[PDB]
Amino acid sequence: YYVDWKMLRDVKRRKMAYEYADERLRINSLRKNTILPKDLQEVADEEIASLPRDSCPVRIRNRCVMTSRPRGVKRRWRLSRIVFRHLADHGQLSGVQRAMW
Amino acid sequence: KNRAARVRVSKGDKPVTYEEAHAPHYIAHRKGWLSLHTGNLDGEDHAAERTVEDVFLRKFMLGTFPGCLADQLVLKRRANQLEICALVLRQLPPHKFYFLVGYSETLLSHFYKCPVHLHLQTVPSKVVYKYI
Amino acid sequence: RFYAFGKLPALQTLREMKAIGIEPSLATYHYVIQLFYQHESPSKGSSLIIYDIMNEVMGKRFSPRDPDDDMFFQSAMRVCSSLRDLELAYQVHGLLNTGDNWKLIGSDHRRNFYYSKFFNLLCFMEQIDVTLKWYKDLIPSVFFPHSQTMIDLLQALDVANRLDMVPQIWKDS
Amino acid sequence: SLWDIEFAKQLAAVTERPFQNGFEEMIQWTKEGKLWEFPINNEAGFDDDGSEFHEHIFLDKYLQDFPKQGPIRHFMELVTCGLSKNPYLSVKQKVEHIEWFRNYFNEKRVILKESGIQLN
Amino acid sequence: VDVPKDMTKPEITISDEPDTLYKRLSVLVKGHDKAVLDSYEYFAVLAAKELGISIKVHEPPRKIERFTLLKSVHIFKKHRVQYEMRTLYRCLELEHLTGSTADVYLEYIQRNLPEGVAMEVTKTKLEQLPEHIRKPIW
Numbered sequence A: 001y002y003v004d005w006k007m008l009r010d011v012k013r014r015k016m017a018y019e020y021a022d023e024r025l026r027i028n029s030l031r032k033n034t035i036l037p038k039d040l041q042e043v044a045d046e047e048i049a050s051l052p053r054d055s056c057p058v059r060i061r062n063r064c065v066m067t068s069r070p071r072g073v074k075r076r077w078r079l080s081r082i083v084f085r086h087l088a089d090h091g092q093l094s095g096v097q098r099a100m101w
Numbered sequence B: 001k002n003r004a005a006r007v008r009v010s011k012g013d014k015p016v017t018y019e020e021a022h023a024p025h026y027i028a029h030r031k032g033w034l035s036l037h038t039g040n041l042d043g044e045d046h047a048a049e050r051t052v053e054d055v056f057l058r059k060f061m062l063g064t065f066p067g068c069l070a071d072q073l074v075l076k077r078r079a080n081q082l083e084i085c086a087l088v089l090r091q092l093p094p095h096k097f098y099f100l101v102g103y104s105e106t107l108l109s110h111f112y113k114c115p116v117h118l119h120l121q122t123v124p125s126k127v128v129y130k131y132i
Numbered sequence C: 001r002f003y004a005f006g007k008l009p010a011l012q013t014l015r016e017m018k019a020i021g022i023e024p025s026l027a028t029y030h031y032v033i034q035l036f037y038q039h040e041s042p043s044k045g046s047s048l049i050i051y052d053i054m055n056e057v058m059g060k061r062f063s064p065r066d067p068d069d070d071m072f073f074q075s076a077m078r079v080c081s082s083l084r085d086l087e088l089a090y091q092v093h094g095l096l097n098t099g100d101n102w103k104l105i106g107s108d109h110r111r112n113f114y115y116s117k118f119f120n121l122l123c124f125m126e127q128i129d130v131t132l133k134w135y136k137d138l139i140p141s142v143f144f145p146h147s148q149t150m151i152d153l154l155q156a157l158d159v160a161n162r163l164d165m166v167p168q169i170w171k172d173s
Numbered sequence D: 001s002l003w004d005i006e007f008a009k010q011l012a013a014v015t016e017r018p019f020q021n022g023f024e025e026m027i028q029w030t031k032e033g034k035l036w037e038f039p040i041n042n043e044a045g046f047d048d049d050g051s052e053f054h055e056h057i058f059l060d061k062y063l064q065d066f067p068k069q070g071p072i073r074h075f076m077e078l079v080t081c082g083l084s085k086n087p088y089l090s091v092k093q094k095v096e097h098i099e100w101f102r103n104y105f106n107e108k109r110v111i112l113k114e115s116g117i118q119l120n
Numbered sequence E: 001v002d003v004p005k006d007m008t009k010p011e012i013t014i015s016d017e018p019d020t021l022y023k024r025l026s027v028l029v030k031g032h033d034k035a036v037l038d039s040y041e042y043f044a045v046l047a048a049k050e051l052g053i054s055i056k057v058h059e060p061p062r063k064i065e066r067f068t069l070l071k072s073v074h075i076f077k078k079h080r081v082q083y084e085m086r087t088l089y090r091c092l093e094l095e096h097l098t099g100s101t102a103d104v105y106l107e108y109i110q111r112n113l114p115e116g117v118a119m120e121v122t123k124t125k126l127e128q129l130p131e132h133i134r135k136p137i138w
């Protein structure tokens, strides 16, 4: 079990987005190019908008990995701010400490 | 009032480990880090991995040695091997202790795909820093 | 397994292989020491032959690569306990520690035989200066005292008149 | 030969003691592959198909079949140049990209001819 | 008293090849707490003096990374908690080394790396000239 249904959704999304990365890239090559004619690019356009909607990366969310919180995340530990503090304050995060200066 | 990772003052009878008697603002000042690994240093990678690994180890160890864990775990990571070091109450017969040592070390070695060492230090009763 | 005097054809075999270039295994030498022991109890000359065969065997560094080899270092030392000869036990030990000591003894029972007998020799045959010394090294560290090694320390302190080491050996025992 | 294997096992059984030291633990572990090799080289374990830098940098060979003067040369020389700078991919994979393009352009001849440039 | 006899069996071979020369070899140790880096420095220097490796040691400026999070679970934005991670450095600069010596010294040093520290090894190696450049011209 992932902690939340939402997290589940996200796992799927990352899987699909991993699978179609090659197709998406190859097509958006054509799409993003001035050199090729527009007639290729409109077909290529429908091509990439044909692809399953959950395969596109912008639909991914970086979520807290233990607690599933959608924001207030620190990218480095993939941790919610709350869970991060909870680990660091027991000193289970090496080299992390309160800051005085 | 800050509450984080604190053990509040009771009527004055409460036994408190050296660890538990020091609030987060004392980390790196008086008490030290319960883990050691390269990941949180300036130019380094995979901090996240090691954090999750850590969390799972504390949970796992706490469940594998029920009731006999004295203080929180110490996790040293060196050049791809993790030495877990624990303070253990004497509860079990040394048969059960060695069984669990071997069982654990093998299990976790196959889980995390790296050599795992386990070092048990045995103690009569929870070492007491304060009150009591 | 048949004749105790069938060591003479076997001895011939022991020379035979030495002609064709193949270095005799520790298993070979073991069986040699087995029949040579069965004929060592009544006659002490075959003893001298085991001791000299061993004496040539011990100037060398081993490669214990054949199947049966454990009982060699079992019975190579086993003879010195019955015949009470310590020098050749020093030699068996110098042999053990040489090539790979660890690889030269197969089992824990057959391991404690070794120290039972060897320390049996060390205690009565040698000065207290040597016995007290190898005591603290062998006993708690490697393999633990049986009854046979227990009685030996008792008879070692009666003859040399040592009343100082009784509390120590008692607390250890 | 199963008997030779049981012989090597019976030999390795008398040979193998429980470790007498740390250095032994580390030695057996290293030979086993559990421990790391020192001094560390990060490229250890991965040779990348024994390829050499010219099977990476110069992709001209796979542009042999493609219209030589067209805008397709422009586009494909860009794709090519991109793959030339790409560390994370193998030779095989780059070539698979190239071929997907071969196949996709050769899939649509129609749109290319109609486009105002005759394209091969 | 009890001494194992004939305990040594090193295995070394000499290939005919011209072992690689290292003009300079820099080793950067990052760690969290200073004291460990000092002990490590002591050990490293000592280890090099015994191999006659002729090294210098200096200390690169420390980096402190700070960041903030909210102090409360729900809503007081006015209150925060700030965390640090301090990275401290030592630099071991070795000069005029050989290939084998480098591999040994580095093996020894790297094995003994304490758990809270990291290491970066910059080897500048000496090569004379490539073949096709020597003195041909096309």
Ligand SMILES: [Mg+2]
Binding pocket: A003, A004
């Ligand atoms: Mg829920």
Ligand SMILES: [Mg+2]
Binding pocket: A058, A060, A061
């Ligand atoms: Mg987003």
